[PDB]
Design an enzyme around this catalytic site. Structure first.
Site, PDB file in Angstrom:
ATOM      1  N   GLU A 107       9.258  -3.870 -11.469  1.00 38.26           N
ATOM      2  CA  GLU A 107       8.073  -3.067 -11.786  1.00 38.26           C
ATOM      3  C   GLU A 107       8.284  -1.575 -11.549  1.00 38.26           C
ATOM      4  OE1 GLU A 107       4.604  -2.228  -9.105  1.00 38.26           O
ATOM      5  OE2 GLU A 107       3.657  -3.846 -10.244  1.00 38.26           O
ATOM      6  N   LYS A 118       0.690   0.386 -14.695  1.00 30.98           N
ATOM      7  CA  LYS A 118       1.567  -0.615 -14.107  1.00 30.98           C
ATOM      8  C   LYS A 118       2.471  -1.088 -15.264  1.00 30.98           C
ATOM      9  CE  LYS A 118       0.765  -4.972 -11.710  1.00 30.98           C
ATOM     10  NZ  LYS A 118       0.593  -4.404 -10.356  1.00 30.98           N
ATOM     11  N   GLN A 159       0.856  -1.195   0.000  1.00 32.94           N
ATOM     12  CA  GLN A 159       0.000   0.000   0.000  1.00 32.94           C
ATOM     13  C   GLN A 159       0.896   1.251   0.000  1.00 32.94           C
ATOM     14  OE1 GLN A 159      -3.458   0.230  -0.454  1.00 32.94           O
ATOM     15  NE2 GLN A 159      -3.267  -1.960  -0.805  1.00 32.94           N
TER      16      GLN A 159
END
Ligand SMILES: Nc1ncnc2c1ncn2[C@@H]1O[C@H](CSCC[C@H](N)C(=O)O)[C@@H](O)[C@H]1O
Ligand SMILES: Nc1ncnc2c1ncn2[C@@H]1O[C@H](CSCC[C@H](N)C(=O)O)[C@@H](O)[C@H]1O
Ligand SMILES: C[n+]1cnc(N)c2nc[nH]c21
Ligand SMILES: C[n+]1cnc(N)c2nc[nH]c21
Lengths: 291, 291
Positions: A201, A169, A39
Site C-alpha cells: 500500500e 489509499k 496511526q
C-alpha cells in the site's frame, strides 16, 4: 547486522530500482513492530501531504474532507499542528464507525457518522459550497472486487467533490487475483514508512489544476510490477540499518521518516534539520504513546 | 444578400469569437436544406477525422469500431475512399437497427446487429485483441437524462475499448435543463458543416497517447457558453455568403466544407487545392444522390 549506506530513501514508487519475486511465505511474518503503528503510518503520510499543500499555498482556507476517518486518533495531532501554525482549516471527518473522543469539542472539526455513497457526496458538496476542498480517503471495505469497488468510490469522490488536491489509499490488486483493468487518478505514488512489513500500500497524492482530471489505466502487467518492486522494497530495503545515518535510530523506516519530517513546517526555529526532525519525531511518538 | 469576406471558417468551437442570446423561436425554422443532409454531415466529419489519423500514421492496420452506425449509407463512401488509397482497415459496424444493404458483401466490413452495453464492449475487446482500435460513436437514445446516459456510455467505450483515437458525438445539454456536471474526454471540438440549422452538436476528436486518459468537467456555466456561441454561429455566421470565396457555391457551409476537404488525401494529382476539393465534393454529392 544488515548494514548499508544510502544517500536518500525511496520516497516514491517509481524510484524503486529493483524487484523480487513475491514469496507467499512472507505473509506469515510479523507485520508490525510498534504499538499504534497504523496511526503513525497515517500521521506521517498526511503530515507530508498537507505540508506540501501549504508549500503551494492551497491549504489555508480549505475544508479537509476525510472519508474513512475513524477512529482517527492521529488526526487530532494533525489538526493541532496546523492550528498552532496559524493555518485556517475546517475538518469534516466522515465514517460510519465512531471517532476517538479526543476529536470532540473543537469548533473547527465536524464529525459525521455516515457511510458515504454517491448521493451523500452530492449533498455535502452542495453544503460545503463554496469552500475549497482537500480530500483524504482511507476507506476500507479485501477481495479484488472489494478494492475495485473502493477505487471506483474514490474516483466518484473526486468527480463530485471536485477537490483542489487529494490523498487516496492505493494498493494494487494482486496479479494472481486480477479481475479487470481500471483507472486511478494520476498523482505521485508516495511510499509509507511504518506500513505493515509486507504491505504493498502507498498513497496517491494529486493536485488539481484547471478543470481537467487525468486518470491512468492499471493493467495486470502493472500489477506484476507493483508486486515485485514492493516485495523488493519490503524484503530487502526496509530491513537495512542505514549506518551512515547519524540518528538515534538507523533503521530504514526511521531514515525514510526523517526525509518526510524534514519537509514539515514548525513555529520553533532550529539550528539544524536534524534538530527539527528529532523534535517532530519525539513530539509524534509522545502523542501516540509510542515509547 | 448577406455577403462578407472571410479568411478561414471556424473549424473548432474555441475559435468562435462572439455570442448571441438563444432565441427559442429559431426552433421553428427550417432545419435542413439538402436531401440526405444528415449523411453528408457525418461523411465530412469522419473523412476529416480519419484523414488526420492517416496523417499521424495511426490509421493503417487499425480496426474502426463504429457504434450507432445504422443505416450508415455514407460509411460505404468512407470505406471505399481509404480502401482505394491502399490503407488497410477492418470496419466493425454495430447497431441494433439494420444497416443499408450497400454495406453487405465486403470482407473488410463486419455488420453486427446488437445494442452495446458495457458487458458486450468487454467481449468485443477480447475478440478484437490484439488489433489497434479507432472508435467512432454516433449513438442516440433527447432529455438531458438521455444525453448524460449516452455520454456515460461513450466514456465506458473508451475505458473498455482503449482506442488509439476516438470521434464522439457531442452536444452539450441546454442550461435551462441542467441536471448535474459531468466529464467528457479531452479532445478537439470539431464543428460540422451541414449540421441542422440550429444544431449545437459538434464532434469530439481525441488521440490517445500513453496509458493516460484526460477528461474535462462540464458545468452549467459551460452549457451557457455553448448555447450562446453555437447560436451566434448558427444565426449569423452560417447564414453568410463568402463573396471572396471563388467557388461554385459561396455559402458559409461550402466554405467550411472546402477547408475540411482540402485535408483529405487522393490518388489523382491536382494542379490546385480548388481542383481537388471540387473533385471530392462532386464525388461526395454524386454518391449521396445530392443534386
Ligand atoms: N463509504 C464509506 N464511507 C465512510 N467510511 C467508510 C466507507 N466504507 C468504509 N469506511 C471506513 O473506512 C475505515 C477504514 S480504517 C480507517 C482508519 C482511519 N483513517 C484512522 O485514521 O484511524 C473504516 O472505519 C470504515 O468504516
Ligand atoms: N447502445 C447502443 N449500441 C449501438 N447502437 C446504439 C445504441 N443506442 C443507440 N444506438 C443507435 O444510435 C443510432 C443513432 S442514428 C445513427 C446514424 C448513423 N451514424 C449513420 O451514419 O447513418 C441509432 O441507430 C441507434 O439504434
Ligand atoms: C497478502 N498477499 C497475498 N497475495 C499476494 N499475491 C501478495 N503479494 C503481496 N502480498 C500478498
Ligand atoms: C432545441 N433547443 C431547445 N432548447 C434550448 N434551450 C436550445 N438551445 C438551442 N437549441 C435549443
Amino acid at each position: 547486522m544488515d548494514v548499508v549506506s544510502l544517500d536518500k530513501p525511496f520516497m516514491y514508487f517509481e524510484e524503486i530500482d529493483n524487484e523480487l519475486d513475491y514469496e507467499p511465505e512472507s505473509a506469515n511474518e510479523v507485520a508490525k513492530k510498534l504499538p499504534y503503528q497504523g496511526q503513525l503510518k497515517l500521521l506521517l503520510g498526511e503530515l507530508f501531504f498537507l505540508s506540501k499543500l501549504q508549500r503551494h499555498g492551497i491549504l489555508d482556507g480549505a475544508t479537509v474532507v476525510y472519508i474513512g476517518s475513524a477512529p482517527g486518533t492521529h488526526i487530532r495531532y494533525l489538526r493541532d499542528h496546523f492550528y498552532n501554525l496559524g493555518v485556517i482549516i475546517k475538518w469534516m471527518l466522515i465514517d460510519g464507525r465512531h471517532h476517538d473522543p479526543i476529536l470532540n469539542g473543537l469548533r473547527d472539526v465536524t464529525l459525521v457518522t455516515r457511510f458515504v455513497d454517491e448521493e451523500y457526496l452530492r449533498s455535502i458538496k452542495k453544503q460545503l459550497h463554496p469552500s475549497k476542498i482537500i480530500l483524504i480517503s482511507d476507506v476500507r471495505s479485501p477481495s479484488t472486487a472489494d478494492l475495485l469497488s473502493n477505487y471506483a468510490l474514490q474516483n466518484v469522490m473526486i468527480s463530485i467533490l471536485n477537490p483542489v488536491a487529494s490523498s487516496l489509499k492505493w494498493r494494487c490488486p494482486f496479479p494472481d487475483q486480477w479481475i479487470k483493468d481500471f483507472y486511478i487518478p494520476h498523482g505521485n505514488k508516495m511510499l509509507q514508512p511504518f506500513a505493515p512489513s509486507y504491505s504493498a500500500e502507498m498513497r496517491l497524492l494529486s493536485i488539481y489544476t484547471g478543470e481537467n482530471m487525468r486518470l491512468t489505466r492499471v493493467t495486470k502487467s502493472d500489477a506484476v510490477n507493483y508486486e515485485k518492486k514492493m516485495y523488493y522494497l519490503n524484503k530487502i530495503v526496509r530491513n537495512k540499518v542505514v549506518v551512515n545515518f547519524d540518528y538515534p535510530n538507523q533503521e530504514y523506516d526511521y531514515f525514510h521518516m526523517y526525509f518526510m519530517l524534514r519537509t514539515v513546517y514548525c513555529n520553533k526555529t532550529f539550528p539544524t534539520t536534524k534538530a527539527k526532525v528529532l523534535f517532530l519525531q519525539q513530539s509524534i511518538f509522545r502523542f501516540l504513546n509510542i515509547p
